């Protein structure tokens with residue numbers, strides 16, 4: 001039997017998709033829910049095609065895609081010393097860019113797009129918010145300047161962002177202890 005004709009295409013990592021819905025009745029951790037996991041190309045698309053586009057979520061929702069075993073929270077062992085490359089969208093870009101950026105971000109993750117530094121990647125998060133949406137790739141160590149910088153440059157190019165745009169990298173330790181947070185790095 002030729003495996004090319006019937007086997008699914010395994011991804012390098014198993015990934016977990018999480019959903020968050022704002023409910024002021026509950027703690028933030030209590031609002032976070034794991035949706036399902038996948039570790040093949042075919043199961044990724046089955047999941048993606050089943051769920052709402054980010055642009056159709058009510059305000060205050062997040063999606064997070066993280067490597068299996070890493071919860072999408074600062075407190076996780078693999079995030080607490082890490083940080084994130086932040087894409088900040090204005091209100092008009094929810095129409096133009098939110099969904100295509102998020103899908104490109106998903107592919108950067110599952111397709112292992114950062115060469116040897118894809119091991120520093122933990123996951124990605126999209127925040128759907130009335131004041132402006134955000135997409136971010138989370139990495140495991142905010143001090144690994146080489147890995148962080150490589151991921152930032154590849155990511156910015158893969159999104160198609162012009163050089164008129166600067167994106168910033170922020171430590172979670174800064175984000176947790178704080179409206180805005182300083183950048184450690186920019187590309």
Ligand SMILES: C[n+]1cn([C@@H]2O[C@H](COP(=O)(O)O[P@@](=O)(S)OP(=O)(O)OC[C@H]3O[C@@H](n4cnc5c(=O)nc(N)[nH]c54)[C@H](O)[C@@H]3O)[C@H]3OC(C)(C)O[C@H]32)c2nc(N)[nH]c(=O)c21
Pocket residue numbers: 022023024025026027028029031060072073074075127129175179
């Ligand atoms: C990624 N992450 C986000 N959060 C929480 O989400 C909020 C993140 O705030 P930040 O300013 O960094 O992001 P952003 O601009 S997208 O704000 P947001 O719209 O998510 O929240 C706006 C406000 O709304 C309130 N909020 C947000 N989420 C919740 C929530 O789930 N439950 C309640 N009761 N209130 C909430 C809170 O007052 C917050 O300041 C913080 O709110 C509280 C509940 C104080 O904890 C923070 C986190 N908390 C923990 N412990 N760990 C995280 O990884 C983490």
